[PDB]
Design a protein around this ligand. Structure first.
Ligand SMILES: C[C@H](Cn1cnc2c(N)ncnc21)OCP(=O)(O)OP(=O)(O)OP(=O)(O)O
Ligand SMILES: C[C@H](Cn1cnc2c(N)ncnc21)OCP(=O)(O)OP(=O)(O)O
Ligand SMILES: C[C@H](Cn1cnc2c(N)ncnc21)OCP(=O)(O)OP(=O)(O)O
Ligand SMILES: C[C@H](Cn1cnc2c(N)ncnc21)OCP(=O)(O)OP(=O)(O)O
Ligand SMILES: C[C@H](Cn1cnc2c(N)ncnc21)OCP(=O)(O)OP(=O)(O)O
Ligand SMILES: C[C@H](Cn1cnc2c(N)ncnc21)OCP(=O)(O)OP(=O)(O)O
Ligand SMILES: [Mg+2]
Ligand SMILES: [Mg+2]
Ligand SMILES: [Mg+2]
Ligand SMILES: [Mg+2]
Ligand SMILES: [Mg+2]
Ligand SMILES: [Mg+2]
Lengths: 150, 150, 150, 149, 149, 150
């Protein structure tokens, strides 16, 4: 449906490099609606829950340590196929292999400093949204631009 | 071969969302020359002729109704391989599947509100140009830049 | 009223330099609505009528010769105080004295190649619009955008 | 270098998709984002924020509009950020705002002015305390040697 | 239309990745690049560059900073390019520079004001001679009919 | 591996069309560090050495003649995988087949006027850097943004 939602986190590197506005603008221009937005410094608990699927992996510690190393801009966007579209707009895991035009393709070089990370699926998105945002922090009335949907 | 021409129409949704300038700029930056331009509200007969290839399709009535629902900005651009190039610059049928960097990839989310449409072939381009424009509305003297062509 | 209109002409230099889209986008982003648009090569009669106030000035011939020397993109924009606003967005007569941020301030260096010219008053706008466009080429209804106007 | 100001992207700015454009302008300028959140203001929050205009005829409509939809509240930090942020926005009448400024580039109606910033340090501190909780604001920052001497 | 000015994107401008942004602004304006190179300025070059301030206490600071890292030196040609380039940059204090100007859009501190241009034709000729060898400057340009009448 | 370097040349057409800043900005935004930069008019000897691999090609003369026909902006960028990344950011040989988002995809239409050319390998990059720049023209002290590499 056109009410699908995804969670996007502009990580510490993205925030430190002043790419917050650039990124938000790309999603606004696309037609997706911002239903949740806030800057915070993630706690270790939040970080470990966010990357829970990788808890047994060697790089787990580094992922958690980095996303908690500084301010992060957390956001939720709503729109048709937003989860898959947001991932396409970001690029692939490795910024160097991402095509120009994509966020990582235009601004990143390292996998561990890949600027932003979005939900990999609807299931993960619903899980992440509930983890990072309280219900009261999410819009309940969403009406995009009627020129966007048939 | 550098005199090839194609027909492009910023549809009602593209105009309503204020994307006319953005789109024209992309083609200008590319090196293509504007040889025809005008804003108009398509009539039903023009729309039905324009979309004649889908006259039997179930979504035909919808295509016609929408393209005639508001102002459209019709354009004709000239340049080497402009027909196929213009299509590549627009993206693919489904905006959600279009790569970032393309017009639809950057601004669209629904197939029925795909922002802009270009001729799919030289054959179609010549037909569409004659259908939407009068001879006197098209430049006869062009010759772009020596910086663009060998 | 919110239905005030002004006439803007991207002159041959602006068109040749590929600034048409850039210019249209600036006015679209501002909130003004395009109600008339077309590219044409002005006739001497049209040019002389357009610059009638300067009929007895030494530079009259030059203004006329230049605006008819190549394609021009004529447009009409509608919105509250659009006449004075469009002039402000363009800059002052001399591009070198125009502040960065304005069209001439950002793109021009010569008075005779000042890219674009807008109506200097509501009276001139109405005169110019009727001169460059036929009634059938102008949108009749626009309906105020709730996000732009009270 | 620790001065802070409160900026609110109004419902019209949010609805027109100008949030990113605006944040980018302040990031590019060199100011640091120390507070950020989207919310739909309540009547009380709106009236307190715009208390200085409470006696004016348009106050009712002003309050009704800012509470009509989502607003993106922000706090930016940097030397002279209060006056600088105002200069970047333009003047009260968007039509009189010079191109290059936010209102100059995007607005046409005084009642749909896109964004509003604190007019003084005193007002900024009041507004910041009104819209944000202490824990929602950064306490770090770390001076950037490329921005300040 | 042969007038020329010297522009130096200082270490802060280079470190902040604004070299392309700045060059693009002058290219779009219609001015022609007739000299360009990145270098790390030496003390003797810097002291001559800021000679008008040699008796002032901040002379040492201006010299130390412009020689602290990579600088992109450029020479642009065009009608009234000296005064125009200054207007495009803004005023000495970036906080007081209007949005739309380089310093107005990107700077916050006087000592980190990103770029500096010649203040007069006399200074431009003097500075161009100090920073560039004749062989590093274009001799063939040819006025663009779309920019000049 | 983060010290890898590549040679990029904005050819006469790219310079003449005013794309130098646009191009440099793209590489700056990506995170790569500018370690060498200068505008010059290549000599025949430099050109023939640069295109040595095509000495027996029928188009060799044309490549040499064009790159020496006007000012060129030569540059060297440093960063992880910069050689392959720079090529990807430029696009493919034929600008018409280059994807929107890439330099050639956004600005070119002719193979012979492809705007910019980058080293095709580390081997070629080191050869080209030594050919176009003296060691003293290249930075030895490099400090990329601290948020770019893990
Ligand atoms: C009152 C002002 C703009 N405004 C908003 N609505 C109106 C209206 N109907 N008539 C006149 N002015 C109006 O918005 C408040 P604000 O949003 O704070 O903008 P400002 O730039 O801070 O302006 P001020 O210093 O006066 O607070
Ligand atoms: C696990 C993934 C990539 N990754 C990030 N760091 C590492 C590492 N050290 N080893 C292997 N993989 C690594 O990072 C999480 P993420 O940055 O979210 O990438 P995604 O957007 O999910 O593709
Ligand atoms: C038939 C085509 C896309 N299309 C494909 N299927 C549909 C549908 N169900 N509703 C609306 N449009 C649809 O629309 C005409 P067009 O707008 O020209 O798109 P194109 O550039 O040709 O891909
Ligand atoms: C008369 C004015 C400027 N002008 C343009 N060319 C000349 C010239 N040769 N001598 C003196 N003035 C000149 O041009 C008309 P215009 O380009 O419309 O400027 P405006 O937007 O009306 O300020
Ligand atoms: C002297 C001027 C500003 N300035 C720069 N640093 C200082 C300082 N510490 N005290 C007083 N003035 C200072 O810097 C030279 P510049 O950066 O070239 O400014 P300009 O573009 O010439 O206006
Ligand atoms: C041989 C290749 C493209 N080319 C292919 N054929 C030609 C031709 N006839 N004229 C000019 N260039 C031609 O040009 C070298 P280059 O411009 O470096 O492209 P590259 O980035 O190496 O792919
Ligand atoms: Mg992930
Ligand atoms: Mg079609
Ligand atoms: Mg005039
Ligand atoms: Mg106020
Ligand atoms: Mg100075
Ligand atoms: Mg090559």
């Amino acid at each position: 449906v056109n009410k699908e939602r995804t969670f996007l986190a502009v990580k510490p590197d993205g925030v430190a490099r002043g790419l917050v506005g650039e990124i938000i603008a790309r999603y606004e221009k696309k037609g997706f609606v911002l239903v949740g937005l806030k800057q915070l410094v993630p706690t270790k608990d939040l970080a470990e829950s966010h990357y829970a699927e990788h808890k047994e992996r060697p790089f787990f510690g580094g992922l958690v340590s980095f996303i908690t190393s500084g301010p992060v801009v957390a956001m939720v966007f709503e729109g048709k196929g937003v989860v898959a579209s947001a991932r396409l707009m970001i690029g692939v895991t490795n910024p160097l292999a991402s095509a120009p035009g994509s966020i990582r393709g235009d601004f990143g070089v390292d996998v561990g400093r890949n600027i932003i990370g979005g939900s990999d699926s609807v299931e993960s998105a619903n899980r992440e949204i509930a983890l990072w945002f309280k219900p009261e922090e999410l819009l309940t009335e969403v009406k995009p631009n009627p020129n966007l949907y048939e």
